Specification:
Elements (H helix, E strand, L loop, with lengths): L2 E7 L7 E7 L4 E8 L5 E3 L24 E11 L5 E13 L2 E14 L1 H4 L6 E4 L16 H5 L7 E5 L6 E5 L12 E4 L8 E9 L5 E9 L6 E3 L1 H8 L6 E3 L4 E5 L7 E5 L2 E5 L5 E4 L6 E4 L1 E3 L6 E3 L1 H4 L3 E5 L5 E5 L2
Parallel strand pairs: 3-8, 4-7, 13-22, 14-21
Antiparallel strand pairs: 1-2, 1-10, 2-3, 2-6, 4-8, 5-6, 6-7, 9-10, 9-23, 11-24, 12-13, 12-17, 14-22, 15-16, 16-20, 17-18, 19-20, 23-24
Protein backbone atom coordinates (compact mmCIF):
# COMPACT_ATOMS: atom_id res chain seq x y z
CA UNK A 1 0.00 0.00 0.00
CA UNK A 2 0.91 3.69 -0.20
CA UNK A 3 -0.44 7.02 0.97
CA UNK A 4 0.01 10.58 -0.26
CA UNK A 5 -1.26 13.72 1.48
CA UNK A 6 -0.76 17.43 0.92
CA UNK A 7 0.77 19.42 3.77
CA UNK A 8 0.02 23.13 4.03
CA UNK A 9 1.74 25.95 5.97
CA UNK A 10 -0.35 27.25 8.84
CA UNK A 11 0.62 30.90 8.22
CA UNK A 12 2.64 33.22 5.98
CA UNK A 13 5.90 32.38 7.78
CA UNK A 14 5.73 28.58 7.43
CA UNK A 15 5.71 28.34 11.23
CA UNK A 16 4.37 24.78 10.91
CA UNK A 17 2.56 22.56 8.42
CA UNK A 18 -0.80 20.77 8.76
CA UNK A 19 -1.86 17.57 6.99
CA UNK A 20 -5.45 16.25 6.97
CA UNK A 21 -5.93 12.92 8.77
CA UNK A 22 -9.07 10.79 8.88
CA UNK A 23 -9.82 9.28 12.31
CA UNK A 24 -12.65 6.91 13.19
CA UNK A 25 -15.83 5.63 11.53
CA UNK A 26 -17.42 7.64 10.01
CA UNK A 27 -14.25 9.62 9.38
CA UNK A 28 -13.51 12.68 11.48
CA UNK A 29 -10.93 14.76 9.59
CA UNK A 30 -8.42 16.65 11.76
CA UNK A 31 -5.47 18.74 10.58
CA UNK A 32 -2.38 17.39 12.32
CA UNK A 33 1.21 18.59 12.60
CA UNK A 34 3.38 15.72 11.34
CA UNK A 35 6.39 15.70 13.67
CA UNK A 36 9.47 13.58 12.92
CA UNK A 37 10.84 14.71 16.30
CA UNK A 38 8.21 13.02 18.49
CA UNK A 39 6.30 9.76 18.58
CA UNK A 40 2.77 10.44 19.89
CA UNK A 41 -0.35 10.86 17.75
CA UNK A 42 -2.50 13.10 19.93
CA UNK A 43 -5.60 15.15 19.19
CA UNK A 44 -7.85 17.82 20.59
CA UNK A 45 -10.96 15.93 21.60
CA UNK A 46 -14.36 15.96 23.26
CA UNK A 47 -12.37 15.29 26.46
CA UNK A 48 -10.18 18.40 26.22
CA UNK A 49 -10.79 20.95 28.98
CA UNK A 50 -13.26 23.31 27.34
CA UNK A 51 -11.41 26.52 28.24
CA UNK A 52 -8.34 25.10 26.46
CA UNK A 53 -10.12 24.63 23.10
CA UNK A 54 -10.26 27.75 20.87
CA UNK A 55 -11.26 26.94 17.29
CA UNK A 56 -9.63 23.52 16.85
CA UNK A 57 -11.52 20.62 15.32
CA UNK A 58 -12.00 17.90 17.92
CA UNK A 59 -12.06 14.11 17.80
CA UNK A 60 -15.15 12.68 19.50
CA UNK A 61 -14.51 8.98 20.16
CA UNK A 62 -18.10 8.33 21.22
CA UNK A 63 -19.19 9.09 17.64
CA UNK A 64 -16.75 6.56 16.13
CA UNK A 65 -18.03 3.01 15.86
CA UNK A 66 -14.43 1.73 15.68
CA UNK A 67 -13.04 3.60 18.71
CA UNK A 68 -12.08 1.54 21.77
CA UNK A 69 -10.75 2.89 25.05
CA UNK A 70 -7.25 1.56 25.70
CA UNK A 71 -7.98 0.64 29.29
CA UNK A 72 -5.68 2.24 31.86
CA UNK A 73 -3.46 3.99 29.33
CA UNK A 74 -2.39 7.59 29.84
CA UNK A 75 0.07 9.88 28.10
CA UNK A 76 1.89 13.09 28.90
CA UNK A 77 4.41 14.89 26.71
CA UNK A 78 6.58 18.00 26.90
CA UNK A 79 8.17 19.49 23.80
CA UNK A 80 11.42 21.36 23.27
CA UNK A 81 9.56 24.68 23.05
CA UNK A 82 8.11 24.25 26.55
CA UNK A 83 4.63 23.25 25.41
CA UNK A 84 2.87 20.13 26.68
CA UNK A 85 -0.28 18.02 26.59
CA UNK A 86 -1.68 14.93 28.30
CA UNK A 87 -4.69 12.65 28.45
CA UNK A 88 -6.01 9.13 27.85
CA UNK A 89 -5.91 6.79 24.85
CA UNK A 90 -8.23 5.16 22.34
CA UNK A 91 -7.48 2.83 19.47
CA UNK A 92 -9.20 3.65 16.20
CA UNK A 93 -8.81 3.56 12.44
CA UNK A 94 -6.53 6.30 11.10
CA UNK A 95 -5.98 7.09 7.43
CA UNK A 96 -3.48 9.46 5.82
CA UNK A 97 -3.73 10.18 2.11
CA UNK A 98 -5.46 6.86 1.40
CA UNK A 99 -3.26 4.69 3.66
CA UNK A 100 -5.23 3.10 6.50
CA UNK A 101 -4.04 1.71 9.85
CA UNK A 102 -6.51 -0.08 12.09
CA UNK A 103 -5.91 -0.19 15.83
CA UNK A 104 -3.81 2.99 15.90
CA UNK A 105 -3.33 4.56 19.31
CA UNK A 106 -5.09 7.94 19.21
CA UNK A 107 -4.08 9.90 22.29
CA UNK A 108 -6.98 12.09 23.40
CA UNK A 109 -5.94 15.31 25.11
CA UNK A 110 -7.52 16.15 28.43
CA UNK A 111 -5.15 19.09 28.91
CA UNK A 112 -3.05 21.16 26.51
CA UNK A 113 -0.74 24.07 27.23
CA UNK A 114 -1.45 27.62 26.16
CA UNK A 115 0.54 27.57 22.92
CA UNK A 116 -1.64 24.72 21.60
CA UNK A 117 -4.86 26.46 22.64
CA UNK A 118 -3.68 29.66 20.99
CA UNK A 119 -3.03 27.98 17.63
CA UNK A 120 -6.47 27.31 16.16
CA UNK A 121 -5.01 25.75 12.99
CA UNK A 122 -3.37 22.68 14.59
CA UNK A 123 -5.77 19.98 15.80
CA UNK A 124 -3.02 17.72 17.16
CA UNK A 125 0.28 16.08 16.34
CA UNK A 126 1.20 12.93 14.42
CA UNK A 127 4.59 11.72 15.63
CA UNK A 128 7.00 10.11 13.16
CA UNK A 129 10.13 9.61 15.27
CA UNK A 130 10.92 6.13 16.64
CA UNK A 131 8.31 4.42 18.80
CA UNK A 132 10.77 4.16 21.69
CA UNK A 133 9.89 7.82 22.43
CA UNK A 134 6.13 7.23 22.66
CA UNK A 135 4.86 8.41 26.05
CA UNK A 136 1.87 6.09 26.56
CA UNK A 137 1.98 4.33 29.92
CA UNK A 138 1.98 1.57 31.07
CA UNK A 139 2.10 0.05 27.56
CA UNK A 140 4.08 2.08 25.04
CA UNK A 141 2.36 2.46 21.66
CA UNK A 142 3.58 2.47 18.07
CA UNK A 143 3.59 5.38 15.66
CA UNK A 144 1.39 5.49 12.58
CA UNK A 145 4.45 4.76 10.41
CA UNK A 146 5.55 1.83 12.58
CA UNK A 147 2.05 0.33 12.38
CA UNK A 148 1.80 0.87 8.61
CA UNK A 149 5.35 -0.20 7.72
CA UNK A 150 4.77 -3.89 7.03
CA UNK A 151 1.92 -3.07 4.63
CA UNK A 152 3.81 -0.40 2.69
CA UNK A 153 5.27 -1.10 -0.73
CA UNK A 154 8.60 0.14 0.68
CA UNK A 155 9.22 0.92 4.39
CA UNK A 156 9.71 4.65 3.88
CA UNK A 157 8.00 7.99 4.12
CA UNK A 158 9.08 11.25 2.50
CA UNK A 159 8.76 14.90 3.50
CA UNK A 160 8.53 17.50 0.72
CA UNK A 161 7.77 20.74 2.55
CA UNK A 162 7.05 23.87 0.56
CA UNK A 163 8.41 27.37 0.97
CA UNK A 164 5.33 29.58 1.34
CA UNK A 165 3.42 26.86 -0.52
CA UNK A 166 1.87 23.42 -0.01
CA UNK A 167 3.96 20.27 -0.14
CA UNK A 168 3.55 16.53 0.31
CA UNK A 169 4.01 13.66 2.74
CA UNK A 170 4.19 10.29 0.97
CA UNK A 171 4.16 6.87 2.60
CA UNK A 172 5.49 3.70 1.02
CA UNK A 173 7.09 5.08 -2.15
CA UNK A 174 9.60 7.62 -3.44
CA UNK A 175 8.17 10.00 -6.07
CA UNK A 176 11.07 10.25 -8.50
CA UNK A 177 9.44 13.31 -10.12
CA UNK A 178 9.57 15.33 -6.89
CA UNK A 179 13.31 16.05 -6.76
CA UNK A 180 16.28 16.86 -8.97
CA UNK A 181 19.53 14.97 -9.24
CA UNK A 182 20.03 11.99 -6.96
CA UNK A 183 19.16 11.23 -3.34
CA UNK A 184 22.16 11.03 -1.01
CA UNK A 185 21.62 8.67 1.91
CA UNK A 186 23.35 9.05 5.27
CA UNK A 187 23.50 6.96 8.43
CA UNK A 188 21.03 7.35 11.29
CA UNK A 189 21.45 6.68 14.99
CA UNK A 190 18.24 5.68 16.75
CA UNK A 191 19.89 5.71 20.20
CA UNK A 192 17.96 8.83 21.28
CA UNK A 193 14.76 7.90 19.45
CA UNK A 194 15.25 10.54 16.74
CA UNK A 195 16.18 10.59 13.05
CA UNK A 196 19.68 11.60 14.14
CA UNK A 197 22.43 11.99 11.54
CA UNK A 198 25.74 13.79 10.98
CA UNK A 199 26.04 16.60 8.47
CA UNK A 200 29.45 16.92 6.85
CA UNK A 201 29.73 20.72 7.10
CA UNK A 202 28.41 24.05 5.93
CA UNK A 203 28.93 27.16 3.84
CA UNK A 204 27.62 30.70 4.22
CA UNK A 205 26.50 32.35 0.99
CA UNK A 206 29.16 32.02 -1.69
CA UNK A 207 31.84 31.24 0.91
CA UNK A 208 34.01 28.17 1.00
CA UNK A 209 32.62 24.98 2.48
CA UNK A 210 33.82 24.13 6.00
CA UNK A 211 34.17 20.40 6.51
CA UNK A 212 33.06 19.64 10.06
CA UNK A 213 30.79 17.01 11.59
CA UNK A 214 27.45 18.34 12.88
CA UNK A 215 25.28 15.76 14.64
CA UNK A 216 21.61 16.69 14.66
CA UNK A 217 18.05 15.54 14.10
CA UNK A 218 15.73 15.83 11.11
CA UNK A 219 12.68 17.37 12.82
CA UNK A 220 9.66 18.45 10.79
CA UNK A 221 7.97 19.64 13.97
CA UNK A 222 10.57 22.34 14.68
CA UNK A 223 10.30 25.56 12.65
CA UNK A 224 13.91 26.76 12.62
CA UNK A 225 17.45 25.48 12.06
CA UNK A 226 19.37 25.18 15.36
CA UNK A 227 23.14 24.76 15.00
CA UNK A 228 26.29 25.20 17.12
CA UNK A 229 27.05 28.75 18.24
CA UNK A 230 30.24 28.88 16.14
CA UNK A 231 28.32 28.07 12.94
CA UNK A 232 25.47 30.48 13.71
CA UNK A 233 27.91 33.31 14.52
CA UNK A 234 29.67 32.75 11.21
CA UNK A 235 26.34 32.99 9.37
CA UNK A 236 25.03 36.16 11.02
CA UNK A 237 28.42 37.91 10.77
CA UNK A 238 27.67 38.16 7.04
CA UNK A 239 24.49 40.19 7.65
CA UNK A 240 25.05 43.89 8.35
CA UNK A 241 23.38 44.86 11.62
CA UNK A 242 22.55 41.33 12.75
CA UNK A 243 22.97 40.62 16.43
CA UNK A 244 21.97 38.16 19.11
CA UNK A 245 19.31 39.71 21.35
CA UNK A 246 18.80 38.18 24.79
CA UNK A 247 15.53 40.10 25.16
CA UNK A 248 14.10 38.73 21.91
CA UNK A 249 15.62 35.28 22.40
CA UNK A 250 17.97 34.87 19.46
CA UNK A 251 19.51 36.48 16.42
CA UNK A 252 17.64 39.36 14.82
CA UNK A 253 18.54 41.33 11.72
CA UNK A 254 17.36 44.45 9.89
CA UNK A 255 14.22 43.69 7.91
CA UNK A 256 15.78 45.71 5.06
CA UNK A 257 18.55 43.11 4.66
CA UNK A 258 18.93 40.54 1.90
CA UNK A 259 20.10 37.34 3.58
CA UNK A 260 22.81 35.01 2.30
CA UNK A 261 22.08 31.38 1.61
CA UNK A 262 23.23 28.61 3.95
CA UNK A 263 24.53 25.30 2.62
CA UNK A 264 24.71 22.08 4.65
CA UNK A 265 26.53 18.90 3.72
CA UNK A 266 24.98 15.46 3.31
CA UNK A 267 27.92 13.19 2.65
CA UNK A 268 29.60 14.65 -0.41
CA UNK A 269 26.35 16.33 -1.49
CA UNK A 270 25.16 19.84 -0.63
CA UNK A 271 21.71 21.26 0.19
CA UNK A 272 21.36 25.01 -0.32
CA UNK A 273 18.86 26.93 1.84
CA UNK A 274 18.05 30.20 0.01
CA UNK A 275 18.47 33.33 2.08
CA UNK A 276 14.77 34.14 1.90
CA UNK A 277 13.99 30.90 3.77
CA UNK A 278 15.90 32.28 6.79
CA UNK A 279 13.67 35.38 7.15
CA UNK A 280 10.99 34.93 9.84
CA UNK A 281 9.70 38.47 9.63
CA UNK A 282 9.23 41.25 12.16
CA UNK A 283 9.78 40.34 15.80
CA UNK A 284 6.49 42.13 16.56
CA UNK A 285 3.93 43.61 14.20
CA UNK A 286 5.37 46.64 12.42
CA UNK A 287 8.92 46.26 13.72
CA UNK A 288 11.89 46.73 11.42
CA UNK A 289 13.79 44.07 13.39
CA UNK A 290 13.32 40.63 11.85
CA UNK A 291 13.80 37.23 13.46
CA UNK A 292 16.44 34.87 12.03
CA UNK A 293 15.72 31.35 10.86
CA UNK A 294 19.11 30.03 11.95
CA UNK A 295 19.61 30.07 15.73
CA UNK A 296 22.04 28.64 18.25
CA UNK A 297 21.47 25.18 19.69
CA UNK A 298 23.79 25.94 22.61
CA UNK A 299 20.91 25.95 25.13
CA UNK A 300 19.10 22.91 23.67
CA UNK A 301 21.61 20.08 23.94
CA UNK A 302 21.07 18.92 20.35
CA UNK A 303 21.28 20.41 16.87
CA UNK A 304 17.96 20.49 15.03
CA UNK A 305 17.49 20.42 11.25
CA UNK A 306 13.99 21.87 11.38
CA UNK A 307 11.68 23.07 8.64
CA UNK A 308 14.04 25.86 7.49
CA UNK A 309 16.51 23.18 6.44
CA UNK A 310 14.16 20.37 5.48
CA UNK A 311 11.99 22.45 3.15
CA UNK A 312 15.06 23.09 0.96
CA UNK A 313 15.17 19.34 0.25
CA UNK A 314 13.23 16.24 -0.65
CA UNK A 315 13.78 14.11 2.45
CA UNK A 316 13.48 10.32 2.68
CA UNK A 317 12.89 8.76 6.09
CA UNK A 318 13.96 5.18 5.41
CA UNK A 319 12.57 2.81 8.03
CA UNK A 320 14.34 -0.29 6.79
CA UNK A 321 15.83 -2.65 9.37
CA UNK A 322 18.79 -0.28 9.55
CA UNK A 323 17.17 3.16 9.13
CA UNK A 324 18.82 5.87 7.03
CA UNK A 325 17.97 9.40 5.84
CA UNK A 326 18.09 10.58 2.23
CA UNK A 327 18.32 14.17 0.97
CA UNK A 328 17.87 15.47 -2.57
CA UNK A 329 17.70 18.95 -4.00
CA UNK A 330 14.40 19.92 -5.61
Amino acid sequence: STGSATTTPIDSLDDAYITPVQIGTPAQTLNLDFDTGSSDLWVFSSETTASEVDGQTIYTPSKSTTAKLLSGATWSISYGDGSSSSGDVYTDTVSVGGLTVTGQAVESAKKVSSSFTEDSTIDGLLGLAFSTLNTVSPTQQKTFFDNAKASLDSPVFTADLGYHAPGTYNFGFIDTTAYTGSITYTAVSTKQGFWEWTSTGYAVGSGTFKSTSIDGIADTGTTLLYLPATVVSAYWAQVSGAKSSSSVGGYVFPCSATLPSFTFGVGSARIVIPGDYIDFGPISTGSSSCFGGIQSSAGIGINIFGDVALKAAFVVFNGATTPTLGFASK
